[PDB]
Paper text:
We also determined a high-resolution apo structure of the inactive [name] mutant EV68-[name] for comparison. The C-alpha distances between the two structures were calculated and the average for each residue mapped onto the two structures (ranging from 0 Å to 1.5 Å). The largest variation was observed around the active site, at the P1 binding pocket. In the apo structure, the areas surrounding the P1 glutamine binding pocket form a narrow and more open channel. With the apo and peptide-bound co-crystal structures with a viral cleavage site of the EV68-3C, we were also able to characterize the large conformational changes that occur upon substrate binding.
During viral replication of EV68, the viral genome is translated into a single, large polyprotein comprised of structural and non-structural proteins. The viral polyprotein needs to be cleaved into individual proteins for viral replication to proceed. The [name] cleaves eight sites in the polyprotein with a preference for a glutamine–glycine (QG) motif at the P1/P1′ positions. The conserved essential function in viral replication makes the [name] a promising target for DAA development.
Numbering used by the authors: 1 to 183
The structure:
């Protein structure tokens, strides 16, 4: 179906397996050598990208106007391969959505596709003790190891998975404005 075709294409061309000291994460490549990863991955000065030691040229843990964690870290990678530019698939504002898919790919969870259904946005989530803003919630019982998983709808890349409470899953919202690249 159309949703799954889109999630599969995003997985096909715009993800890598990232590995920090904290373990494996699904990593979404956004454009050029810029990718995102949940902030609790604790990205260092180097990171394994599909098992290749890759220097980190920059790592920026995003925080909003309120100096509040957004749980996305934007990473610039020292590698020759260039990500296809999917910034046009990113929402421009916070929204709700229907029929979302959570797509994960790691060694532990290879090629995982979960139709999580309706997604609702919130301004708030206390994430393992850290206040966090701009969160998408889906009523599905996600599990540790899916962090960084990409959430999509037909034609939109809307968030990356950051955590869960046993019954619900939470994603950090992706906004086009994050990747404005205006110094």
């Amino acid at each position: 179906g159309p949703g799954f075709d889109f999630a599969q294409a995003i997985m096909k061309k715009n993800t890598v397996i990232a590995r920090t000291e904290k373990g494996e994460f699904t990593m979404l490549g956004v454009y050029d050598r810029v990718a995102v990863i949940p902030t609790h991955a604790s990205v260092g000065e180097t990171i394994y990208i599909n098992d290749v030691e890759t220097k980190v040229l920059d790592a920026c843990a995003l925080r909003d106007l309120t100096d509040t964690n957004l749980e996305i870290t934007i990473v610039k990678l020292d590698r020759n391969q260039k990500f296809r530019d999917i910034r046009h698939f990113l929402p421009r504002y916070e929204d709700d959505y229907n029929d979302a898919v959570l797509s994960v790919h790691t060694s532990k969870f290879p090629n995982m596709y979960i139709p999580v259904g309706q997604v609702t946005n919130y301004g708030f989530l206390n994430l393992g003790g850290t206040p966090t803003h701009r969160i998408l919630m889906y009523n599905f019982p996600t599990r540790a190891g899916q962090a960084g998983g990409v959430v999509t709808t037909t034609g939109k890349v809307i968030g990356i998975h950051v955590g869960g409470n046993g019954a619900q899953g939470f994603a950090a919202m992706l906004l086009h404005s994050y990747f404005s690249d205006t110094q």
